[PDB]
């Protein structure tokens, strides 16, 4: 930024408020956010498993 003290900085960073998507299963950032008919999204690494174990319908923890 811009302050009297040259070389160092007070400590303020401007940014915009936004929302982040995380997998409620593995609790980690999902590279590719795949939105399910349920509404929420998940990580392929996770969806892939559920899809197999369950072929008929899909169960969601958030829902
Ligand atoms: Zn996951
Ligand atoms: Zn859901």
Description:
- The PDB classes it as protein binding.
- Keywords: RING-type zinc finger domain, tripartite motif-containing protein 31, Structural Genomics, nppsfa, National Project on Protein Structural and Functional Analyses, RIKEN Structural Genomics/Proteomics Initiative, rsgi, protein binding.
- The protein has 63 residues and is α+β, with helices and mostly antiparallel strands.
- The protein has a single domain, classed as Zinc/RING finger domain, C3HC4 (zinc finger) (Herpes Virus-1, 2-Layer Sandwich).
- The protein is 16% helix and 6% strand.
- The chain has a two-stranded antiparallel sheet with strand order 1-2.
- The relative contact order is 0.17.
- One zinc ion (ZN) binds next to loops.
Please give the oligomerization state of what you see. monomer
Number of strands: 2
The CATH architecture classification is 2-Layer Sandwich
Spatial gap, N to C terminus: 44 Å
Number of helices: 1
How large, in whole angstroms, is the Cα Rg?
A: 20 Å
Q: Give the helix level as a range of percent.
A: 10-25%
Count of all domains: 1
What ligands does this structure carry? zinc ion
CATH class: Alpha Beta
What is the approximate shape?
Answer: rod-shaped
CATH topology: Herpes Virus-1
Strand arrangement within the widest β-sheet reads 1-2
**Would you tell me the structural class of the helices and strands?**
alpha+beta
The major pleated sheet works out as: 2 strands, antiparallel
Succession of helices and strands: EEH
How much of the sequence is in beta strands? 5-15%
CATH homologous superfamily caption? Zinc/RING finger domain, C3HC4 (zinc finger)
PDB class: protein binding
Keywords: RING-type zinc finger domain, tripartite motif-containing protein 31, Structural Genomics, nppsfa, National Project on Protein Structural and Functional Analyses, RIKEN Structural Genomics/Proteomics Initiative, rsgi, protein binding
Assembly: monomeric
Entry title: Solution structure of the RING domain (1-56) from tripartite motif-containing protein 31
């Amino acid at each position: 930024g811009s302050s009297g003290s040259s070389g160092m900085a007070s400590g303020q960073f401007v940014n915009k408020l936004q929302e982040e998507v995380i997998c409620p299963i593995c609790l980690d950032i999902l590279q590719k956010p795949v939105t399910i008919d349920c509404g929420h999204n998940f990580c392929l690494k996770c969806i892939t498993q559920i899809g197999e174990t369950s072929c008929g319908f899909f169960k969601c923890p958030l829902c």
